[model samples]
Target: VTTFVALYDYESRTETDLSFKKGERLQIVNNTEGDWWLAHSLTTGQTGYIPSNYVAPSDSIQAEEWYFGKITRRESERLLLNAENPRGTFLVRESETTKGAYCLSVSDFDNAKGLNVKHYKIRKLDSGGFYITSRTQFNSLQQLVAYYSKHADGLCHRLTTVCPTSKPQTQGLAKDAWEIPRESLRLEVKLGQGCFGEVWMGTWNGTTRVAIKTLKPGTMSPEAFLQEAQVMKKLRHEKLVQLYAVVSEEPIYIVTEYMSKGSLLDFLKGETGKYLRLPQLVDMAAQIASGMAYVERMNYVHRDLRAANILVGENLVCKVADFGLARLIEDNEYTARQGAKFPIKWTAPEAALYGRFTIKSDVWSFGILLTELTTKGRVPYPGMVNREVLDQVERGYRMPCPPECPESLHDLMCQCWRKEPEERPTFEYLQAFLEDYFTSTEPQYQPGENL
Candidate 1:
């Protein structure tokens, strides 16, 4: 039987006061109905009937019980368990239930040091077994002797001489390997479709409606998808569209805030059947410029900048989306797959020929977008192929802004689409100048009431 202790304090008789600290050790000897007794086994082996509250078991001399598995018992002094199983090394201190010598029950031996050991044939194991061995070292002779006796099965098996139990290996998060239920995400609404995947509008958190882009399966591996998701996640801004979340498992889903007004292309085609006024168009340009400024600050190069990728929302707020073809512009170069080039009309000469794209190259694309916005969505080089368009731009023949457009706005658009990227003004300059166009009071450029 094990001992128990009463936790309290009492006054000494006629001499000094006697009190015990919270964790003070006391030896339990015997218990009779009302009173319990304690013995000073370590100090003098003295015996006395102390209050039940003051006496408890003396673990100071008791062997720390441990559960051992896989190790085999070689003798009373040595124990051995199979080292080949790799579960060979694990042990735990002996408690009352596992105190004395008990049969090498496989159940007690199931765990190594109270931890589940793994089995792997590919991994290396120490000599005498195909798996690693470990043990718990005891400082006290009594504990050492007791542990050896209880774990004789492991020592007797001759699997190992070491007694220290191995530390439990880390069990990583259970992913796709276990056939667990894959997280399900629904596409709330269809946003659009492209070569890469179909885009949808969905509600996330049951409140914030987001744009969801579900990529074609097999387009990217899970690891790479996670990487791209991380990049998209880092971006957060009022003007720049944010990636709310990504579902990388089967039927992958990507979520972002919904832009109700759709792409700039739709706005230009008068999809709403109402031609936007010059002031409204200027505000749209400012929003687009603000979003691009944010992207440029992050050193991101948007290879595609046509109206299709420019999303307009409430208040005519413009947000640039679809970063599948975007790349980090580092070392003065933008690298991407060979066949992934966007529309040639918006591409800078350097990007069209040498595949060179920098912030200036993006500015060139923005210049083309500005002209498209001014013309109310007239297609550049309407009848020409991509090559013919690039050839014309290379020869200093850029698409002109319609004569009916504000001359000042036309001049600004023309300056942006210059043949040489170096000749084009920085987005910072363009944004500052556009601000003047909006703030100007010379005469509000208002459209006809019919417009």
Candidate 2:
């Protein structure tokens, strides 16, 4: 039996059709011929003949690999060029109107033009011989193309070179971390709202719960969102929020691990004063530092880092989340466009003045997050408006220490907010400092060990 996953819902009225929901897994029991396969649902345990197109290889679904069926000329060209495969490398697209018919696009190397591409429709005749629409009949498409490679001149010669012997390679994001189909996700409840989108509690594969950040329609194009996904896909750390998948279909969603405790800012507010012991707060801070340290090592700058963007999971474990503005910082800096929205009070002075975002700018935001933690979620710069806060920060003003914050902890925050970005402590240093503090202090509360 071969495993498959439903790409869309199928409902059966007769024995020929199989009924299943999108995202359900199926095991094919019989597929000896024709367009239908006899399969048993893993979820419902029902069995029937389902149209083969309704399901895809289980491995393909999990990998989010692109299938070229019915794609437009522009999209097909983009995919072919981006694939960077040698000549004769090809992809098959199932014909939309005819069973047993397929469209084939091949990458052809040209001595003068570099790469020339072409498409062909291959159909099986009544006698079971396959032929290109304008070419002679042969036992199969491969045999037909082989004949043209030896006989035809120009484009056909380039298109029919021996099939590329190398394994297929995908460029941008890792093959395992690409766009997830929207149909696979079922949004349940609104978790929260943000400037860019709404967060929802969702389920994938009918059982595994996930937190989905659905982008507002027209806020950003799928191409741009995919660029962000390319960056996030490379990051994997226990302290970092895990990105399970991204759905770039309409009403795009970024799926990540669900944090049951929600935003750290909200969680702190709910718990209020003295509810969490001092060591617990230190543990949470250390977790965030650990996550940030990984980001730094990856050469990524989280342009928008704040208390609200950090999430708390079970056992007081905190993770850095919401990478909407995160980007790779080549040469240590990325400048935002002039009109980009930035958190005035939380932003570093250099970023506020020049829109330059770097790891140090994120360090500045971490200082603000620490204040939020110590003050039980009090807003930064209590009475100052954005404009006033921006003005004060630009002139070297800093927020006073939280009422109950330890002097040592407050000193670390101060170090994170130094006048020059270069003077700020790196996340690695911050993480070590917190770890050392926890090790030396008398244990006030037992925190969960790293998972």
Candidate 3:
């Protein structure tokens, strides 16, 4: 029998389904089932079916203590550099790009370079197995790791202890229904007040905590608000702060998953956020692009792509929130008197000049969001006012790279700023480029190929 620990809270949907809280130990009662498992909860002495990836084996890592399976370089480096980790803390992990390759990464420090993560590539032979530097091929990754720990013969630092455990972000809660009763909702703290309305912390039936996005009385028509709800309800991805339900009455409300860390704009400006490195920041952009890709797939264009609009959840997973609500923020009938100032800085040429909006325009905004990520939440074009931004962009001028920002990342940012909307890469292509970018200096394909 094998036992595991629940990683996140899982809600039970059906009678035979098992709902387990985070960190509860579960005994694998059966494994004949494939992705779903029949497990006995050691906590409550109950048995039910649960998803496999939702829990990890308690005693070992499937022999995973020394091997942090399938985690990315961005993640591995973040953990290795933690001040808690002493020198020579190391782990073996599968590479993100190359299928058969692995990296033996170790941590160390020097005055000139400060904290460092050194990777030694583990290659495989055509006829047989794996080795780090020679054809001294080992049968498995475990053997290769064991050999290197003892002999620092050519390595920067010898393996002392395995790196700290890496936790997996949950796929999502078991939310299948679309209507959460207003009587059941308890609105608490006010998160933020915006043009559309106010955002608040709310608990569903005083149980599952959620974020409430309340729409101001005249901000939107009931028909348009419900239309957005219909569109948003279709979005189901781990990278999105999910839309749980909507109240379609006057003074309407939208209930969504409450992200712990709040918005990316605030996260970058917060104290603990100063610790992030370049690669980790890129990963956060990649996560948002992933959610945007799903949005694009559904033929939806997120008009607002700023850093403040994106949310950071557990385990550094960034989710695109309030994705379809931007349409509600506009007003023309009432604008007979005045006008709503657009997010002119982040807006692309045609859309910013005229009223055309598309995924390409969103791409342009994404480039600005990239700057926000690279510059640690600085507003676009620091010294320039709105007209100066429009005036400069009119002459085909784009922002220069920040001193800390790499050229390749800046190149992608410029790519998104191209005058021609058709020339900008799709969200799908952008996500692929970012995720695989740090793995190799030269990407497998050109940026424009997929556009």
Candidate 4:
């Protein structure tokens, strides 16, 4: 039989059932089958079947480490005083009866042999510092140590220097850089929905309106979401969406600047005759190319770059958003493993056939996005399914320029769809070309008689 500690209180409903209170010790007799187990309660001196989930293995608890779960005050004090660790090192355990309070035990390892451990009841004060005692409070454990270091000989060592032999694996993003407390967010109306979660229009600090992307429960784990957040954190450009903060708590949310005009695809479709001029269209394309140029320089590949993923702000400013499939390439190329999804209609021939992706492949997608802009969000390859589009691309088929699109723009788009990935122009070249086009086409100054 093995000893276990009850994690929750359970009352017996029948003669064959077992009853126990939270933190009560029990001895397991049998766990032959599934959910039910035979256990003998130490407190009641009775044996009966109990649900396995009610108890945790006793060996899992450590005397000299921090714990967030239940432990009696007496047991906590005994462990804190007896643990073999150096001075300033401590253990923190949640208070058995008090909410938002903790029991802290700091070791005075340098003290003369028998006298070492010191206990403190730490509670969160109204002003935010943790109350260490009746007359002393500190904002952090470091603050408490700083105060004691000058007066106490044993604690003169810096608390920050204390290190344990084995450290626990951390989950989620770094709290100092990305975490946003749940209390600070006020969620508002739902803006849109995707496969992963819903986008909501929310306000942070009651005044700064922001777009919040909340990941659905069970859709993604905290670690998986943290990886995406890390990618967003490393990238910063005016033409790229700015990630303000991430709520790493349950029901994870990513906060970013809200785009008032929504996506470029939607805006182009809603355009009327006087709503957007030709020059404005050219400027939007330049902005997207500029953003992609920055991404290329960073050695990153945006696997999914299209009109829908490009967000529009005030004055028709376009910013590249959504780094779900983006990855930094150490080398010059990346090959997608089998079963990965690819937008065949927007992909280059090399990418469609061999699953290879590079900066040049993204340039091919940019060509399709240009077509999307000129055609006002019409689907690429009209009447062709994804499979057919794949075959067509392999057969060297390319889309003709939209009826009203300038010949110069159409030529640029064609150059991006070259059969070989190496033949496609880099984003840097594309950005410069578009900027020059915009400048040269501006209305030229003419000689005037009135002076």
Candidate 5:
């Protein structure tokens, strides 16, 4: 006799395991699917893999009582008579190009809900879940029934909605603690409409302000999203933005400590004009570079390193934010690609030409950021397109800094723009250099009123 144990989620209904009890002995019958096994326990009767979360040792399992009475399958081919009015309603069709849809067995099927379709339905199936064309055209009423019947399994039922893990109400964030009066503090919209999401500024508690980032749909896969959350959850560093909490239900939102002065880019533009002297500029650059060094030390590459991504908090403290594009460079250097809004002027020659990104590429962008800081918000290579920038770079034309820019900082910026990424300095070296630059500089220049 073979016994199988199955585990089930109290909420998601996802099946997890089906195997023999802890010490009971059992033998396999047919090892079908290779993943599922027929084993015997002292009390349990039979078990096999249903879904990883569905089966547990404590769960009660009865004999397979249901039997298939009828099985119907079909396949169909259709030619559109009219593009605009084809079938006259929205249609659901098999998604031929989903990334991982093919990983499922024949019993599992996925289809796309046509956003542009007029109307259509699969009124018939050919036993294995393929659609079939009948001689007569059926409307929505007929389609629903046919789909329900064909999709029904002997005992399995699908849930209308999926809820993540069921834990105590306190397992997630406490709503009461975070709620605040709108009038307590002013809310200013920060960065608006980036590729990833919208960022807003608001007060959380009565006194504590925060930056809220709400993600848009389809920006990242669920797995990648969870990975980012998990990574951020355990991270607690002063140089990096502190994640107050994550709201993971539909349309995820992340809350972090608000920077009063906005980003380094804004600071450079005098948005919060507490403009510093040359010494202050060097100190600010050193602080930002230190944060980057910390990130690199933790084996993380902030793929997008630019002025706009670096937030400046009170007392000129810099905290690097927006790790959405971050990737782990555990062993080898990463190759960067031309992102959706690739900063062409900030890109190194090799990255611009080969689409390869690495720590060196990040250094190149950082160099541009340093230039931005020195120039106090001048657009890189003003009035130059991507192709034009590449052309100039190819012919030995380089980014220019203001005449008042310190020679040492200018030289470091040029080093960051090296043609070969391998020639760029490590973050640690850059950090040390910047630290030394800050300490050695004498207090001579004031924040140029019109730099």
Candidate 6:
């Protein structure tokens, strides 16, 4: 009831504004007046109005691990009245009466009165927030849910759960579906250009929003491009972006799951990165590492592993994009060339020098990527030219730890930059290590000690 963690840095520009660093635990003094909450920064012991969107509840139930799914009221009511649910058993679901709205349902158990279920739509504040009982406003549906789960002040009973019913949705599209009709896609806007085509924000079948990569007419043979999709369709992981379908024809379309937040590169360069927390940075690595581990297990070498290609979608669930797409597109040794399209800084010594593109080479790229994440978007090797990078890396000189980065993380990055490609750690090992770093009960290592 007293705390929320800052998601980004906020500078007090005015006398009434509050300044708080990202990840600072804040005691919210008042929130009902407007979009700005009166908060006391726990670290500094100072109070002022802070933008409500900048902070969030420190702990939440992972929506993925639970039976949190869109279900009808008829479906949930049946579950709530079930004997196993007991009293106070609860689950959140999409509102049946209100489209794009969420409703909370709970089992109201009474031996004498029998069982009944209670339901409430998660209400929204006209000015930028949400609540079940609008007296206690929140920035998100998750925060509102988190608050009520612990408090009985506004609800029938405290929300409790063992609602491990259905598995969270993953993917089943690409396995059975390979080709999508062009008419199914309504290209809404251009997102960015891909390595070989223009990527768009589109809707499939008028309901499923997807990222559509359109190859220009006469760009490449449609059959060859479809083969790339053949391999892509078979590869699926939670950490990896899922390929949906391809329109194999003139100006062929490659549709994928749309990442609303776009690439990690853009996010790091935007407003959110200005307040980056170390935990957020580490979590990004863990997700990316897991995605790459899956790719390696599928016997695909990315040949392109950089911050720019990892997409952080709506949930802040980061996943890698364009896995093995580089190698699939380029069969030549152009990536190893000095004047190639990508930077030499992320290239492993062997990959840059001898055309040895492998999973180990991807590991080398990830090291520089860790620096990019920690440094908050600084280009690798700072001022070194590609030639200098090649020569210096040839001499086994690794990039230095970022000044603000923790020693343990820098140590992990150093392991990724081992001189010989085969000597470096695998993505499988890395995913395990990063998972530990992200989830241990205590911080795996101290924050920047040198700070």
Each candidate structure's TM-score, on Cα atoms with residue i matched to residue i, is: 0.52, 0.57, 0.69, 0.54, 0.51, 0.61
lDDT of 3 at 60: 55
Kindly give the number of clashing pairs for every candidate: 46, 0, 1, 0, 35, 1
RMSD, each candidate, Å? 30.9, 21.5, 7.0, 22.7, 26.3, 19.6
State the lDDT of candidate 5 residue by residue for 1-451, as single tens digits: 2433333211211133233333233334433332233344445554333322222233222211111011111101111111232222122333244321111001111255331111122333333332223332234433433443454322122212111111111111222223222333344676666655778886543334567777666555545655676666455555677666555553556677777677788788875534567866776777677777877677666667888888886556688887544442121222343434556777777766775666778888889888778878677876677657878986878876666588888899888888778888888888788767744332222111221
Best by lDDT: 3
TM-score of 4: 0.54
Q: Which candidate number would show the highest TM-score if scored against the true structure?
A: 3
Error of 5 at 196 (Å): 3.7
Candidate 6 per-residue lDDT, tens place, 1-451, comes to 4578876666554466677887788887534544467788789998887777566666542222223457655447655665567677877777666666667777775576566677767656477587665457788766665777787665667777744342122242322346867886799999888545798998765545678878767556677777777788778777888887788987888788788788898899899888978876887888899899998898888888999888986435789887766654442334445554556788888887777889899998998899989987888888787768888888878877789899999999999998877789999999888766844342322121221
Residue 129, candidate 2: how far off, in angstroms? 71
Model 4 segments more than 4 A misplaced: 1-177, 217-221, 272-274, 324-342, 439-451
Model 1, residue 242: what's the lDDT?
A: 65
User: Between the candidate structures 4 and 6, which one is better when assessed by lDDT?
Assistant: 6
lDDT of 4 by residue, 329-413 (tens): 1122223422223456777777757768788989999999998887777888877876578778778888887786888899999
Tens-digit lDDT track of model 3 for 1-451: 7778886677765467688898798988545545567889999998888877777777453445667778777668767877788888998887776687877788877678777887777778687788766646688887777877797656766778788753442232232445545776789899888866888997765456778889888777877878778877777876778777787776788888888888999999888578888878988999889989988888888888899899986557799988867766547732221234467788887876676778999999999999999888998988888767777997988999887799999999999999999999999999999987776543322221111
Report the CA-based lDDT of candidate 1 relative to the real structure.
Answer: 0.53
TM-score of 1: 0.52
Q: On a 0 to 100 scale, what is the lDDT of residue 449 in model 4?
A: 15
lDDT score for residue 429 of model 2: 97
